[PDB]
Structure formats: structure tokens, C-alpha cells
């Protein structure tokens, strides 16, 4: 995606849950760091379209495999560590989506890109991601999981 004039890339994040309130947690390609799927928003792309493209590209799923349970209202922003930093990108502004997986686990394919975002995934408990994502994303993850919590835990009831 293209860096806005403040130095932020627009971007969508995806929280995928199951019926017992677990969420899909994926290992960044060739690292030991884990996160939710996140993708860029191409010009002309709506946030929802960008989310579905990211879903296909890195999770291998269709609209048919999921249902959208919620989404965040406005941009959530994080800045990149100065070290890990054309117009210079200093961070991301993100819109987040809560999906329920309704197809079998086997529909998930994280290996279709020539450069995967992820090596693979596993199910984890709902709150686990907050303490586990890399620290500069922790503020954002905490707000995302809190906004999505009332929806997911009602599913796990």
C-alpha cells in the first residue's frame, strides 16, 4: 500500500475466532514472532475488500469460509521502532475485522504465496495474543481484543 503524508501505511488486521472463543495465531515467516494477519490497502480498495484479499492471499480462505462478526470504527495506529524503519514509513494505521471460521481448519492454507506472510498457525486462547505480540504492537492489540471481546466470549458461552 502507499504511505500517507504522515508516514503511515493503511492496513487491515484480521482476528479469526472459532466457537469456543479461541483465535488464529500465526508465526511470521522465518521468525519466532507471531501475530494476526495484516495486509495493505491498495488505492481504490475498501477496507473490507483489502481484508478479503489478505484472507485469500495469506490464509487461503474465501468469503464463504467465514462470517464477519465485527470491525473497528476508526484507525488504530502504531509507530515502528526507529531501528526497524521514497517517503519513509514510520508505522501503520489499521482497521480490524473479527471473523468466525465456519469451514474446516483444513481450508486454511498459509503457503500459497511465493513469499508467505506466515509459516503456519495454531489456535490459542483469546487473550494470549496481547502478551505475546511484539511490544510496539501491544497497545493496538490490547484495544482490538477488548473491543472484540464481548462478541467472542458470547460465542464461547
Residue 37 to residue 74: CA distance in whole angstroms: 18
Which pairing describes strands 76-79 and 38-40: parallel, antiparallel, or unpaired? unpaired
**Contact indicator for 148, 15 with CB cutoff of 8 Å:** yes
Distances (CA, A) of 136 to 53, 54, 140: 25, 22, 8
**DSSP states along 17-60:** E-TTS-EEEEEETTSS-EE--EEE--TT--HHHHHHHHHHHHH-
C-alpha cell at 143: 484495544
C-alpha cell at 38: 495484516
Class of domain 1-157: alpha beta
Q: Give the chain's end-to-end CA distance (angstroms, integer).
A: 39
Which pairing describes strands 8-17 and 91-101: parallel, antiparallel, or unpaired? parallel
Residue 149 to residue 151: CA distance in whole angstroms: 5
DSSP reduced 3-state for 152:
helix
DSSP reduced 3-state for 132:
helix
Phi, psi of 24 (to 5 degrees): -75, 120
Method: X-ray
Reference 125, options 18, 23, 8; nearest CA is 23
Neighbours of 98 (CB within 10 A): 24
Q: Running DSSP on this structure, what letter comes out for residue 150? A: H
Q: Cell 495486509 identifies what position?
A: 39
Question: Å resolution of this model?
Answer: 2.0
| CB-count exposure of residue 40 (10 Å: 0-12, 13-18, 19+) | middle
Residue 11 to residue 70: CA distance in whole angstroms: 16
Domain boundaries, the chain: 1-157
| CB-count exposure of residue 124 (10 Å: 0-12, 13-18, 19+) | middle
Q: How far is CA 88 from the centre of its chain?
A: 23
Neighbours of 9 (CB within 10 A): 17
Reference 26, options 61, 50, 71, 64; nearest CA is 61
C-alpha cell at 67: 462470517
C-alpha cell at 80: 515502528
**Contact indicator for 63, 81 with CB cutoff of 8 Å:** no
Amino acid at each position: 500500500s502507499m504511505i500517507d503524508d504522515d508516514g503511515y501505511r493503511p492496513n487491515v488486521g484480521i482476528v479469526i475466532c472459532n466457537r469456543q472463543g479461541q483465535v488464529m495465531w500465526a508465526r511470521r515467516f522465518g521468525q519466532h514472532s507471531w501475530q494476526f494477519p495484516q495486509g495493505g490497502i491498495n488505492p481504490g480498495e475498501s477496507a473490507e475488500q483489502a481484508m478479503y484479499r489478505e484472507l485469500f492471499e495469506e490464509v487461503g480462505l474465501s468469503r464463504k469460509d467465514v462470517r464477519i462478526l465485527a470491525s473497528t470504527r476508526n484507525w488504530l495506529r502504531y509507530k515502528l521502532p526507529k531501528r526497524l524503519v521514497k517517503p519513509v514509513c514510520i508505522g501503520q494505521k489499521q482497521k480490524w475485522f473479527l471473523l468466525q471460521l465456519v469451514s474446516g481448519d483444513a481450508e486454511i492454507n498459509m503457503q500459497t504465496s511465493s513469499t508467505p506472510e506466515f509459516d503456519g498457525w495454531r489456535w490459542v486462547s483469546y487473550w494470549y495474543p496481547v502478551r505475546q505480540v511484539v511490544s510496539f504492537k501491544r497497545d493496538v492489540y490490547r484495544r482490538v481484543m477488548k473491543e472484540f471481546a464481548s462478541v467472542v466470549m458470547s460465542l464461547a458461552a
